[PDB]
A paper describes a structure:
Cyanobacterial aldehyde-deformylating oxygenase (cADO) belongs to the superfamily of ferritin-like di-iron proteins and contains a di-iron center. To gain insights into the reaction catalyzed by cADO, we determined structures of wild type ADO from Synechococcus elongates PCC7942 (Se) with different treatment (WT0, no treatment; WT1, co-crystallized with iron; WT-HP, soaked in H2O2), and solved the structures of two SeADO mutants (Y122F and F86YF87Y).
To explore the effects of H2O2 on ADO activity, a crystal of wild type SeADO was soaked in H2O2, and its structure (WT-HP) was solved. No electron density was visible for the H2O2, probably due to its unstable nature. In our WT-HP structure, a long-chain fatty acid molecule with a bifurcated head-group configuration fits the electron density well. In the WT-HP structure, the helix conformation of H5 was restored, and the two coordinating residues His63 and His147 approach the active site and ligate the Fe1 and Fe2 atoms, respectively. The water molecule that bridges the two iron atoms in the F86YF87Y structure moves towards Fe1 and is not coordinated with Fe2 in the WT-HP structure. The two iron ions are bridged by one carboxylate ligand E60, the Lox ligand and an oxo group. Both iron atoms show saturated coordination with an octahedral geometry. The higher coordination numbers of di-iron center, together with the fact that the crystal was obtained after being treated with strong oxidizer H2O2, lead to the speculation that the WT-HP structure represents an oxidized form of ADO. Furthermore, the coordination mode of two iron atoms in WT-HP structure shows a similar pattern to that observed for the R2 protein of ribonucleotide reductase (RNR-R2), in which the oxo bridge and the coordinated water exist at the di-iron site in the oxidized structure, while both are absent in the reduced structure. We proposed that the Lox ligand is likely to be the analog of the possible intermediate product hemiacetal, thus the WT-HP structure may represent the intermediate state in reaction of cADO, following the entering of dioxygen and its reaction with the substrate.
Numbering used by the authors: 10 to 231
Write the structure that this text describes.
């Protein structure tokens, strides 16, 4: 792709902002989770530190392409999901917080970042390669915890999914056209996110009917 074209740079201004904002919010989210889960405080602080590194990497990706990120756009993009995390944290709802960041958001990021890698400029490709591998660890942390605590967490997981999965589906739709400009096909993003999230839900303990119901709250939101 022509990384120096005005159409590419325009789309990149919003995409770069979105990823910078997402990493920043993930840093705050894992730091908040560290307070909520004393037994895993050290591990969660380590995950937060990785997010800070990711944020700085993506800031450099924008600099490399001479793109100024549209942070106002990115704030608004995350706002509804972010405020839901904040409310859950205030309520001491650790399960909801874990689902939002560790599973929903990390799965969205894994799906999107892996689709970006083969169309990314060489500088951004190497950065993204390093970021996605941390994302596997983040998702794995959430899966391990929720699986180990499945019975106690299940009802809240269902409630949290119903409220928050539609928000990420709306985000997926909002980003689709800019992502297409960057060479990332919407069909791939949708499939890969649905597969990743569905598999995560199966891995933690949900049945086929439960996975379909949970996934449908997202798909039906469009
Ligand atoms: C600037 C280069 C990265 C471009 C990748 C394409 C991204 C397009 C989809 C937008 C969704 C990004 C979600 C980011 C959330 C990050 C959360 C986390 O790090 O745990
Ligand atoms: Fe990250
Ligand atoms: Fe992460």
């Amino acid at each position: 792709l022509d990384f120096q074209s005005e159409s590419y740079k325009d789309a990149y201004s919003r995409i770069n902002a979105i990823v910078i904002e997402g990493e920043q919010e993930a840093f705050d989210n894992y730091n908040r989770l560290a307070e909520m889960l004393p037994d895993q405080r050290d591990e969660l602080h380590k995950l937060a530190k990785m997010e800070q590194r990711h944020m700085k990497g993506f800031m450099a990706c924008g600099k490399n392409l001479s793109v100024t990120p549209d942070m106002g756009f990115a704030q608004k993009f995350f706002e509804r999901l972010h405020e839901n995390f904040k409310a859950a944290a205030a309520e001491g709802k650790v399960v909801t917080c874990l689902l939002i960041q560790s599973l929903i958001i990390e799965c969205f990021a894994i799906a999107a970042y892996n689709i970006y890698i083969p169309v990314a400029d060489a500088f951004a490709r190497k950065i993204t390669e390093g970021v996605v591998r941390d994302e596997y660890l983040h998702r794995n942390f959430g899966e391990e915890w929720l699986k180990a605590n499945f019975d106690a967490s299940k009802a809240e997981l269902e409630e949290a999914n119903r409220q928050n999965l539609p928000l990420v589906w709306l985000m997926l739709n909002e980003v689709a056209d800019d992502a297409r400009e960057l060479g990332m096909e919407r069909e791939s993003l949708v499939e890969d996110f649905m597969i990743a999230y569905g598999e995560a839900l199966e891995n933690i303990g949900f049945t086929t009917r439960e996975i379909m119901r949970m996934s449908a709250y997202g798909l039906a939101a469009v």
